[PDB]
Symmetry: none
Subunit: 130 residues, 4 copies
């Protein structure tokens, strides 16, 4: 265990202390619990296992730059793709849902590129073969 120092916006810290009354004791324990529950679903998929995955995110299809960026890595790694669903959620935003399949290690590596590239609300739900 190590003692770390993080810097959080005044807003988040306020939203946090708020939740700290519906559930804590002190920020440390509040932050610890949330962080732990959130990471539980973020384990590293190991190269070797097969399965599927649901990658969802939002982006403005109003920007040709991001649009071409998200569209390029998609086609270039079409091997993982099973089908992608698109839905305009407002005049500028497109909600994209991509069903991926293959090596879970590759699926997660691929999804993480997207989630980090104008992409917002990106979520990856890994579904390892069972």
């Amino acid at each position: 265990m190590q003692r770390v120092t993080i810097t959080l916006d005044d807003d988040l810290l306020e939203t946090l202390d708020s939740l700290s009354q519906r559930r804590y004791n002190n920020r440390s324990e509040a932050i610890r619990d949330i962080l732990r529950s959130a990471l539980a679903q973020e384990a590293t998929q190991q190269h070797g296992t097969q399965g599927f995955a649901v990658l969802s995110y939002v982006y403005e299809h109003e920007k040709r730059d991001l649009a071409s960026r998200i569209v390029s890595t998609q086609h270039h790694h079409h091997d993982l793709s099973v089908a992608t669903l698109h839905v305009h959620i407002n005049h500028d935003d497109c909600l994209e849902i991509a069903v991926l399949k293959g090596d879970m290690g590759d699926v997660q590596h691929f999804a993480d590129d997207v989630i980090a590239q104008g992409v917002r609300h990106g979520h990856l739900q890994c579904l390892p073969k069972e």
Copy 2:
């Protein structure tokens, strides 16, 4: 913004760093800040007034519905992805009622309330 000191065990810091490698987080701080903010939106309850969209996905052997995608993930299991639109409160209640029914596994709900 403030600076806060917290103690995290070696098992967790490992996932956090493991996760930071993947998403390209510069520092633990931006990581935790993103994970925190993001986690506070998924757990909080959607007030039965604000509108938006949501993605409901789950595996198994109507007004809030924009479209649902079904895919066979083996001979027995079916992955179903429902894009939902409406009262974020109705959306979530309907989701939660689905995610706990009979043989519904890996249920997940991602809410996208209006900007």
Copy 3:
């Protein structure tokens, strides 16, 4: 280049002229000449041949399915769009099977053989 003289009904020609406007067909000849060439293609790509197909229909263990999309077009009716893959032969059969079923209306199968 040969000349073929065909007697065609007035009503039919009205629809062809309408289609020509929407497409830019300079004259009937270019129009017929094009519809024809496209139909004969759908006819050469009829078993043994692999590809994709789009099966859609409104509705109140062998699976050539890649994914199916469902959209509620009203309280009572649902639009189903299945993307099929595999042998165009088995694909056409699966499709006929689906279309005969009770309830199913407006069935259409669009084949897309390996091109």
Copy 4:
């Protein structure tokens, strides 16, 4: 009825005559008329002022959109299926516009006007 004359290349007529043996077309006219009648049944002009849905699909390498599905049918081509809702005239107009774009092959529009 009108007597229409059209010029067809020898290749197509060869393919046409062959197809005619399998289908029972007793001459080029019957062949042409029937292929033509069946193809125009799916191409009536949609009128503005009427509502409904539509499925637009094609291959590639007013918010009429409800949802679009994309599938990779090979390493280069993409099958795209768009569920459209709105004025049928605009839907069709839009589809013809998509179908006219270079790069778009196998375009097909299935119109589902409001039922009852």
